[PDB]
């Protein structure tokens, strides 16, 4: 179904002629879509494969992270004043109380962006360096892309049959998030409103409130 | 034959005899030895890239013609290509050639729906074959796509393929011009050309928009 | 071009011979005799052919580009395209005259009337 | 093996595993091809040439983008437009483009003459670089030397290898600075030296994070 | 999942005993014949044909009873009578029946002619469906294919199996919903699309309860 020769393809029925040879249904998410031929080389394909999973995982975290403050604000904590929207939350660091987690002054109460940058550089840098090093103090399980040992406390990667279907489930939920995050970015620039607000508008008047409502927004004017 | 082999013309003129990528030998049309970057070193990517160029080419040639005709015809209100899409939202809608009753399109969603369904079938047929033809060249199927049999002679087909790519590359370059000229001048390509023709020393990029571009 | 219906254009030109809004330098009486004579000569020339296939596909001066002057499959496909466009036009022009009888308008006029009828 | 070989320095330092194709055989091999863009040996070769040519253009560009502004600030000379992203518009001013202000220098008046000469001059020059020309035919593409090494600072092979590393590292530093100048120019819309002056005056209230970052979404700047 | 002995059942886990004749091998088999009406294999075959014909008509009817109402209240077009339980009355008007409200479409004026033409055309069509004719010869009385599958969506037998289930499932939902259309129309003189808007407007107050019901006594 999702592996082997007779796997799922990106063009459905009209995919036989669009399946690059090097794509033989071995890795997860091989719908046979490399028209450009970017992953022709075995080495280049491997590097892109790791990059895709890393992006997919960041995207998945991003999708929740770009909606959770807005959700709680609309109904819940209701404390992220203008910080509920993802593309207006980072500016909350320069607030009078600065960045308050859950909008609670007692939590974090950060008011120095430089410190945040330095803290992130050392934290993310070390973890990323370990990921690149392919080896670290924690259990690595001998797989740079899929380091199960320490990063999988629940042991859901125990049997390969679940692993094979879980790995395609990861990339497919991941690719959807990457596609949607790209959506968040574009929608944000064109509409200027929060992504969950854009949805409300589409439900309000689907024919009127859609992407073609803002069609003439960026028109070069003589 | 002058367009193939090792004696073919090259993009750097005389200063290209000692500067030729190994993979570009003179087998495929439009070979001018311009592969300065490492792209297309592997034949698999090169074969994939060759098709994308012809596709981007045939599209550009259609686009270049279609971005000028409506602007050069009356009745269409000499609409600019970058301002044609908005017409669907006008009260009159899209009336081909300006003649009322022709299409009278007013729903952008309906137009996109038919385009997606029709183009998906068409693009699918172009990749995995279909009713028009099966087991034919991916970029040069011929048959139903060559009704006038203009390329029956292999020799003629070779020179004609050189003509197709060279016209396409010119169209691709000029289409890129249409994109930038519109984003800078804000006027249609024909209007920009007419302005230059009138007062070239005054109406050009440098004397009009170059200063405000920074 | 003129904005006049194809049915109404018949009488308009009869009253004032004209083409593309340009008055022709010929009274309708001479044009009427000319049309009959010209078409008479043309059709007599066509009837001279004795080959049944060549009466339908003369070729020669009528196929200057030599598109279907052979027996190839391209000739067969081209002839298949001709009759299809021919049968479509026959039915379509039957539409023109029936629509002009019923609705009163011409081709473009019927199209506009239908769009506004909604 | 200080710069070339297996004990060469890496872009991540201690936590670094070099790609197989990167074997410290060329200058500036800090083993950084995480995207696998130079896996193909032919693509790698062409990419190395682009890097050296880009680095040399950037080194000239970085020096040339600040020199008029440094002279204007210190009052050494008055230019029609000292800021780098505005020097091109000098040709459209009243007296044309005068080098270092002095009307007797160059005194260019028409952009068409500048454009056409540059096409002819650079067209021949770049043709000589790839196909060889008056300076010599058959010399290294990236390191021709000969006429382009009059001082002979590359006669010693060992020094030439180490100096090639210095060229790339200054060049890579120049390329990063050029991108910085462009981004800073597009945001601050002020010359690079001016941006530095402001930072030195109040480094805590002039940084991008404090002046533009908070206005990069919803509130324009 | 939908065929064989392990097929899903209408009562879920609680299905337990199922009719012996009601095995797999047929689309839409959920093991529901508690009335035991298809015990005879001959009658079971007939009932299977009746279900798919009632289902196909229901799908057409469900889509056909909602579209003129949707277009009328969406501003897409102006009909004489958008609501399905009144569209028949359009023939008894000044302008007769005009498709999409356009006087230059169909423009019917005589209910007889409408009735006569339907009887002749439907009679021949139904006769062709039971004895073959211009569209094709009869092989499966409910799944002809050939001229009736020009797009070839069911060329592969595996897809044909799963697709038949989709039709009976979608069909059955149409039959239930179309049965609702009949009742909702009698209980509420408003069209079915109007009912949906009212339920969305105030579901607590606008529903079969807090309205009608008590009137039905
Ligand atoms: C030695 C310390 C070390 C630390 C603190 C981290 C920390 C992290 N690694 Mg990591 N790594 C470390 C070593 C290494 N990593 C990797 C390979 C990876 C990969 C392939 C990925 C991470 C990811 C992550 C992040 C996801 C959180 C997580 O554990 O998710 C799992 C547990 C609960 C969700 C996280 C901050 C993920 C990431 O970057 O997310 C975007 C990710 O995809 N690491 C290797 C190579 C074998 C390492 C070798 O030492
Ligand atoms: C010891 C830890 C160490 C770490 C964490 C890094 C990290 C980095 N080095 Mg590096 N280096 C390190 C040691 C050393 N470097 C060098 C020599 C170089 C060179 C010559 C270069 C680097 C470069 C880089 C950057 C590559 C860009 C990238 O991957 O962006 C990923 C970053 C992100 C996705 C975001 C990071 C957070 C964000 C800024 C907030 C990167 C941030 C390259 C660079 O960019 O130079 C400036 C480069 O050209 N390093 C040496 C001496 C040999 C080191 C010695 O220890
Ligand atoms: C890497 C090279 C390069 C870069 C990054 C820039 C960047 C810039 N130039 Mg510029 N220029 C460059 C080269 C050149 N300029 C000019 C002549 C001008 C003028 C007259 C003006 C600018 C201006 C500008 C700024 C506004 C953008 C614009 O309208 O562009 C205009 C760009 C051009 C006119 C040059 C076109 C490309 C150049 C010929 C490419 C050189 C390589 C090959 C010859 C191309 C072969 C094909 C901007 C920051 C404007 C400015 O300063 O605004 C305040 C302005 O008015 N430039 C010439 C001589 C003809 C160049 C030659 O190389
Ligand atoms: C459009 C008007 C325009 C004007 C008025 C000038 C004016 C000038 N340009 Mg200039 N330029 C102009 C446009 C342009 N220039 C240039 C590019 C240059 C360059 C590259 C140079 C100049 C130079 C000069 C100066 C040389 C005079 C000098 O100091 O002589 C000093 C004395 C001499 C040079 C020797 C005597 C010269 C005199 C002509 C004697 C020769 C007479 C001959 C017998 C006649 C010619 C044919 C003979 C040789 C067979 C001068 C003030 C030069 C400069 O800045 O020098 C300081 C210089 O090098 N321009 C370009 C871009 C291509 C232009 C575009 O429009
Ligand atoms: C990739 C190529 C490309 C693309 C994407 C487009 C896209 C578009 N074109 Mg275009 N065009 C192209 C190539 C292209 N064109 C080329 C190469 C030409 C030169 C022949 C034209 C000439 C052209 C004209 C003249 C017009 C457009 C128009 C349009 C816009 C609407 C088209 C439409 O109404 O539906 C699709 C069009 C059809 C399905 C054609 C219908 C068949 C026609 C109507 C019958 C022929 C005329 C008929 C005999 C008239 C009867 C009365 C008459 C005798 C007086 C649209 C954005 C219209 C517009 O208003 O721009 C905004 C417009 O009027 N195009
Ligand atoms: C540090 C150098 C530098 C700086 C400070 C600027 C600054 C500016 N550029 Mg520019 N540009 C640069 C380098 C630079 N550019 C280079 C190197 C290139 C070549 C790729 C361009 C190509 C470029 C283009 C094509 C355009 C700009 C435009 C603009 C203006 C923004 C217009 C806008 O978006 O608002 C409002 C939108 C508009 C005014 C409509 C346009 C702005 C003042 C735009 C402009 O010229 O505005 C008139 C624009 O069209 N630039
Ligand atoms: C192609 C496409 C969808 C393809 C669907 C496919 C393949 C189907 C999926 C299935 O396979 C599954 C999953 C399962 C299979 O068993 C069955 C099928 C059914 C086959 C969507 C396009 C959808 C494309 C859409 C809707 C695009 C809208 C674009 C807009 C609004 C643009 C607006 C503007 O661009 C302007 C005009 C000017 C700019 O300046 C400003 C902005 C605002 C950016
Ligand atoms: C060779 C080489 C070598 C080395 O190695 C490297 C390098 C250098 C990189 C390379 C190069 C490359 C290049 C040059 C590229 C380019 C491209 C392009 C420009 C394309 C276009 C492209 C373009 C195109 C397609 C175009 C298209 C268009 C179209 C369809 C149109 C459409 C339309 C019309 C009609 C009209 C209306 O009103 C509007 C619309 C609707 C819109
Ligand atoms: C290694 C790696 C690995 C993995 O795998 C992947 C990846 C990541 C991708 C990679 C990376 C890469 C990178 C980093 C890149 C960068 C680039 C750049 C930035 C360049 C610049 C570049 C830049 C440059 C050249 C610059 C140039 C400039 C110049 C000439 C100048 C000019 C001028 C002057 C003087 C002055 C005036 O007033 C103006 C003008 C006249 C204009
Ligand atoms: C399984 C079981 C087992 C054991 O045996 C027990 C029992 C219980 C017996 C069984 C069950 C059964 C059932 C459930 C049944 C149901 C049925 C139905 C409801 C049908 C419908 C059915 C329904 C249907 C067809 C429908 C159809 C419809 C139609 C045609 C419509 C038409 C129309 C339109 C469009 C519109 C207009 O305006 C009007 C009209 C003209 C009128
Ligand atoms: C397959 C194919 C084939 C052929 O051959 C070629 C080609 C075409 C090239 C290919 C394609 C590819 C693609 C499609 C790609 C895409 C990508 C994307 C869209 C994304 C990523 C990637 C993406 C991503 C990661 C995303 C990310 C995001 C994130 C993290 C988030 C962040 C955030 C948060 C949390 C919160 C706050 O408040 C805000 C922020 C800060 C903002």
Automatic annotation (TrEMBL), chain A:
Q: What does this protein do?
A: The light-harvesting complex (LHC) functions as a light receptor, it captures and delivers excitation energy to photosystems with which it is closely associated.
List GO molecular-function terms, semicolon-separated: chlorophyll binding
Q: Does the keyword Chloroplast apply?
A: yes
Give the protein's recorded name: Chlorophyll a-b binding protein, chloroplastic
Q: Where does chlorophyll a 7 bind?
A: 169, 172-173
Instruction: Name the protein family.
Output: Belongs to the light-harvesting chlorophyll a/b-binding (LHC) protein family.
**Which species is the source of this protein?**
Chlorella sorokiniana
Instruction: Kindly list the positions annotated as binding chlorophyll b 3.
Output: 57, 131, 135
For binding chlorophyll a 6, which residues are annotated in this chain's numbering? 169, 172
Binding-site residues, chlorophyll a 1: 31-33, 39, 52, 55, 102, 169-170, 173, 175, 202
Residues where chlorophyll b 1 binds = 10, 57, 112, 120, 128, 218
UniProtKB/TrEMBL annotation, chain B:
Cite the binding residues for chlorophyll a 1: 32, 34, 40, 53, 169
The residues listed in the UniProt record as binding chlorophyll a 4, with positions renumbered to this chain, are 163, 167
Where do the annotations place chlorophyll a 7 binding? 196, 204
> Where would you find this protein in the cell?
Membrane; Plastid, Chloroplast
User: Hey, which family's this protein in?
Assistant: Belongs to the TDE1 family.
Q: Which residues bind chlorophyll b 3?
A: 58, 132-133
Output the lineage of the source organism.
Answer: Eukaryota, Viridiplantae, Chlorophyta, core chlorophytes, Trebouxiophyceae
Q: Which residues bind chlorophyll a 8?
A: 213
Sequence positions that bind chlorophyll b 4 = 85-86, 115
**The protein's name:** Serine incorporator
Residues that, per the record, bind chlorophyll a 2? 56
Indicate which residues the UniProt annotation says bind chlorophyll b 5: 103, 111
Give residues annotated as binding chlorophyll b 6: 103
**Residues where chlorophyll b 2 binds:** 56, 115, 123, 126
Which sites bind chlorophyll a 6?
205
Instruction: Name the residues that bind chlorophyll a 5.
Output: 166-167
List ligand-binding residues for chlorophyll b 1. 11
Q: Which residues bind chlorophyll a 3?
A: 58, 142, 164
Q: Which organism is it from?
A: Chlorella sorokiniana
């Amino acid at each position: 179904e999702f592996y082997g020769p007779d796997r799922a393809k990106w063009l459905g029925p009209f995919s036989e002629g669009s399946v690059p040879s090097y794509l033989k249904g071995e890795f997860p998410g091989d719908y046979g879509w490399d028209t450009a031929g970017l992953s022709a080389d075995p080495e280049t394909f491997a590097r892109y494969r790791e990059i895709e999973v890393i992006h997919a995982r960041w995207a998945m975290l991003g999708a929740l992270g770009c909606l959770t403050p807005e959700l709680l604000q609309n109904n819940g904590a209701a404390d992220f004043g203008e910080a509920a929207v993802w593309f207006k939350a980072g500016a909350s660091i320069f607030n009078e109380d600065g960045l308050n987690y859950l909008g609670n002054p007692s939590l974090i109460h950060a008011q120095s962006i430089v410190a945040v940058l330095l803290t992130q550089l050392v934290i993310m840098g070390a973890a990323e360096a370990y990921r690149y090093s392919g080896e670290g103090p924690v259990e690595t399980s001998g797989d740079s892309l899929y380091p199960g040992g320490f990063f999988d406390p629940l042991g859901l990667a125990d049997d390969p049959d679940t692993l094979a279907e879980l790995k395609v489930k990861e990339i497919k939920n991941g690719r959807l998030a990457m596609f949607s995050m790209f959506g968040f970015f574009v929608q944000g620039l064109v509409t200027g409103k929060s992504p969950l607000e854009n949805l409300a508008d589409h439900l309000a008047e689907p024919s009127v409130n859609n992407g073609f409502a803002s069609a003439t927004k960026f028109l070069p004017l003589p | 034959s002058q367009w193939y082999g090792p004696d073919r013309p090259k993009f750097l003129g005389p200063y290209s005899t000692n500067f030729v990528p190994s993979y570009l030998t003179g087998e495929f049309p439009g070979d001018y030895g311009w592969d300065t970057s490492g792209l297309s070193a592997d034949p698999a990517t090169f074969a994939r890239y060759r098709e994308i160029e012809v596709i981007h080419a045939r599209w550009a040639m259609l686009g270049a013609l279609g971005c000028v005709v409506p602007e050069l015809l009356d009745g269409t209100n000499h609409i600019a290509w970058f301002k044609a899409g908005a017409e669907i939202f006008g009260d009159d809608g899209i009336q081909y050639l300006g003649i009322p009753g022709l299409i009278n399109a007013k729903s952008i969603v309906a137009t996109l729906i038919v385009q997606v369904v029709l183009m998906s079938y068409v693009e699918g047929y172009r990749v995995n074959g279909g009713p028009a033809g099966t087991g034919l060249d991916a970029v040069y199927p011929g048959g139903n796509f060559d009704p006038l049999g203009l390329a029956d002679d292999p020799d003629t087909l070779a020179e004609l393929k050189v003509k197709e790519i060279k016209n396409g590359r010119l169209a691709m370059l000029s289409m890129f011009g249409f994109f930038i000229q519109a984003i800078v001048t804000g006027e249609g390509p024909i209007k920009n050309l007419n302005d230059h023709l009138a007062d070239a020393s005054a109406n050009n990029f440098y004397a009009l928009y170059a200063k405000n571009l920074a | 071009v003129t904005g006049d219906s194809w049915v109404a254009a018949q009488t308009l030109v009869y009253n004032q011979p004209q083409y593309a809004g340009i008055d022709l330098p010929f009274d309708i009486y001479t044009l009427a005799v000319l049309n009959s004579v010209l078409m008479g000569g043309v059709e007599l020339f066509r009837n001279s052919e004795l080959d049944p296939e060549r009466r339908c596909y003369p070729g020669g001066a009528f196929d200057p580009l030599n598109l279907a002057s052979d027996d190839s499959e391209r000739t067969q496909k081209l002839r298949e395209a001709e009759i299809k466009h021919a049968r479509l036009a026959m039915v379509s022009f039957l539409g023109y005259t029936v629509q002009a009888w019923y609705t009163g308008e011409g081709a473009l006029g019927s199209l506009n009337k239908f769009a506004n009828g909604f | 093996v200080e710069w070339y070989g297996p004990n060469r320095p890496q872009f991540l330092g201690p936590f670094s595993n070099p790609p197989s194709y990167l074997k410290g055989e060329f200058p500036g091999d800090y083993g950084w091809d995480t995207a696998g863009l130079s896996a193909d040996p032919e693509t790698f070769a062409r990419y190395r040439e682009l890097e050296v040519i880009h680095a040399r253009w950037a080194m000239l560009g970085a020096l040339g983008c600040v020199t008029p502004e440094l002279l204007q600030r210190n009052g050494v000379a008055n230019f029609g437009e000292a800021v780098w992203f505005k020097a091109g518009a000098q040709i459209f001013q009243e007296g044309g483009l005068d080098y270092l202000g002095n009307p007797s220098l160059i005194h260019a008046q028409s952009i068409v003459a500048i454009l056409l000469t540059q096409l002819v001059l650079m067209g021949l020059i770049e043709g000589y670089r790839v196909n060889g020309g008056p300076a010599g035919e058959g010399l290294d593409a990236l390191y021709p030397g000969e006429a382009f090494d009059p001082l002979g600072l590359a006669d010693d092979p060992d020094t030439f290898a180490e100096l090639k590393v210095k060229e790339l590292k200054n060049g890579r530093l120049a390329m990063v600075s050029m991108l910085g100048f462009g981004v800073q120019g597009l945001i601050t819309r002020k010359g690079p030296i001016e941006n530095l002056a402001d930072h030195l005056a109040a480094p805590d209230a002039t940084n991008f994070w404090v002046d533009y970052a908070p206005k990069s979404a919803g509130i324009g700047y």
